[PDB]
């Protein structure tokens, strides 16, 4: 069922799959093994279905959070890097890919949202969310707007929802207590209420998604956006003098983005486990392999030490790390999927008015518990 003698790789369409395919063509020239990199839609969701019948790719790229539910279903193979290999990657990134004491993926890069702003429109970015309404009113009198970011994915609204005390699963005594969910406490209501109020006051539009926000910022129509380092590539080609900075505070407290480690898992049903190890270990996790991916769409801060040491002199990488340092590393427990689909419905319903903030978050909390 999965075909023997070639590597099929899945990676999400916002990452540098072209640069990854350049690593796969160096691999193919060298080994004779054909490598096809693909980016299907909803791939985080297609993988557990197809791979359960034992199908799907040999290697799946995603943030570590969805990988514990994959491992729990026994859909990921235990990777086998020797100690020499592990020492080239930061020890905390291995932690994100451990499940029941076993490494279940190769960590690639550490991702956090940042505030991206157009210095032409706004040379001094706002340090607080509370000053954003006024900022929009001034900018609209010039035919611009203050802020446009992707509201259809809770990943993007979570930093605000958690700033005042929202949380996913409380971390106590070295586990994630799965009956203690903080999506419906006073912090979560305050943060999501602020976002809803911005929409109600015409400062943002509730339908805005990733394409809409990305185009508005890159055509210089909005002053600010919130996005990861993969988005820097299209800003660079497109004329906007931009900066990358700390997320604005809410009620004095730092915005707390969920930090994701982009990771490579090996399908349990794959017959090419030994080849996937060769590609990931000796081709991708190279200075050259990561540069090939990085030149297509930036990775952020990377798990590989040798390459990170020249990536950290980049101001934007420092801002990414500070925003990451102020947030929380995502848990990889299997309940993460239910959490994300619950918060997603909660944010879309609250944003549009389909539900009040209080019962949208109350419904989100019953579904996680």
């Amino acid at each position, epitope marked *: 069922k999965i075909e023997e*003698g070639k590597l099929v790789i899945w990676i999400n369409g916002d990452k540098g799959y072209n640069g990854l*395919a350049e690593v796969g*063509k160096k691999f*193919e*020239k*060298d*080994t*004779g*093994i054909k490598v096809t990199v693909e980016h299907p839609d909803k791939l985080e969701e297609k993988f557990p279905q197809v791979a359960a019948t034992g199908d799907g790719p040999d290697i799946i790229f995603w943030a570590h959070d969805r990988f514990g539910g994959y491992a729990q279903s026994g859909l990921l193979a235990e990777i086998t890097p020797d100690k020499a290999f592990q020492d080239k990657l930061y020890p905390f990134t291995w932690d994100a890919v451990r499940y029941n004491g076993k490494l279940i993926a190769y960590p690639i890069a550490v991702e956090a949202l940042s505030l991206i702003y157009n210095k032409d429109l706004l040379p001094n970015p706002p340090k607080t969310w509370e000053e954003i309404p006024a900022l929009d009113k001034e900018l609209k009198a010039k035919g611009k707007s203050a802020l446009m970011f992707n509201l259809q994915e809770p990943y993007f609204t979570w930093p605000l929802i958690a700033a005042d005390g929202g949380y996913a699963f409380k971390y106590e005594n070295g586990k994630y207590d799965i009956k203690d969910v903080g999506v419906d406490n006073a912090g979560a209501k305050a943060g999501l209420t602020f976002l809803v109020d911005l929409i109600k006051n015409k400062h943002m539009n509730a339908d805005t998604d990733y394409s809409i926000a990305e185009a508005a910022f890159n055509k210089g129509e909005t002053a600010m956006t919130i996005n990861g380092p993969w988005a820097w590539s299209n800003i660079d080609t497109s004329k906007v003098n931009y900066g990358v900075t700390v997320l604005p505070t809410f009620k004095g407290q730092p915005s707390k983005p969920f930090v994701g480690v982009l990771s490579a898992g090996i399908n349990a049903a794959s017959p090419n486990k*030994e*080849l996937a190890k*060769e590609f990931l270990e*000796n081709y991708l996790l190279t200075d050259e392999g990561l540069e090939a991916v990085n030149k297509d769409k930036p990775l952020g801060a990377v798990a590989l030490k040798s390459y990170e040491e020249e990536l950290v002199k980049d101001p934007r990488i420092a801002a990414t790390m500070e925003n990451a340092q102020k947030g929380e590393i995502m848990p990889n427990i299997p309940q993460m999927s239910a959490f994300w689909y619950a918060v997603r419905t909660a944010v879309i319903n609250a944003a549009s008015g389909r539900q009040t903030v209080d019962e949208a978050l109350k419904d989100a909390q019953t579904r996680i518990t």
Partner: single-chain antibody
């Protein structure tokens, strides 16, 4: 760091057999396909067959089924080619090459004494240093899958093995001067030397990597004044 040690030469006679050895170092021997290529004076290069050392799978060209047998010793990182029933016409330099004909051993000369067509042009050419050199290679079938043209270019200086210059039509190999530029797609491909130098005297082959027999072109014998 990658090396493919082959013995310099074997002296053999008709009806006998010889076992040719290829010693691989500097890479993971189990995960790379290994090809064997024959180069007879007066004939271009033809693929004999290949071995995947990790599971021992083999594929043979028709002219070497029942003439060649390929084997591996996992533990010594050595590939073997057995030639049976030798005849005068089997006198050639025999190469082992790794991957998509990416690195070549230096070749063993054996002396027996006592579907896809690749049209390369011009077959020989004489240019002066500094001039622009254009070599074309036309394939009887598209070599595109989509992106990705299964076509490479090689430089063979006299008495040396072929050395990969450009792979996948346009990607210059590591170490190659930037004067070498491959271009093209589908069936028409070009190798351009933007400004030749004297060191560039060599024989230039294109080779398709789409499917067996991974056929080579007739070559461009390039000389520099």
């Amino acid at each position: 760091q990658v090396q493919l040690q082959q013995p310099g030469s074997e002296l053999v006679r008709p009806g006998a057999s010889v076992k040719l050895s290829c010693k691989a170092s500097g890479y993971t021997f189990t995960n790379s396909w290994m090809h064997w290529v024959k180069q007879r004076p007066g004939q271009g290069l033809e693929w004999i067959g290949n071995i995947f050392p990790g599971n021992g799978n083999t594929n043979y060209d028709e002219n070497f089924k029942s003439k060649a047998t390929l084997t591996v010793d996992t533990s010594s990182n050595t590939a073997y080619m057995q030639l049976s029933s030798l005849t005068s016409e089997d006198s050639a330099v025999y190469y082992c090459t790794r991957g998509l004909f990416a690195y070549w051993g230096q070749g063993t000369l054996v002396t027996v004494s006592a579907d896809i067509v690749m049209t390369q042009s011009p077959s020989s050419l004489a240019m002066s240093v500094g001039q622009k050199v254009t070599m074309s290679c036309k394939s009887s079938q598209s070599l595109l899958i989509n992106q990705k043209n299964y076509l490479a270019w090689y430089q063979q200086k006299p008495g040396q093995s072929p050395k990969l210059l450009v792979y996948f039509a346009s990607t210059r190999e590591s170490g190659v001067p930037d004067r070498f530029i491959g271009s093209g797609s589908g069936t028409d491909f070009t190798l351009t030397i933007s400004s030749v130098q004297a060191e560039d005297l060599a024989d230039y082959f294109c080779q398709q990597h789409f499917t067996a027999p991974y056929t080579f072109g007739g070559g461009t014998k390039l000389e520099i004044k």
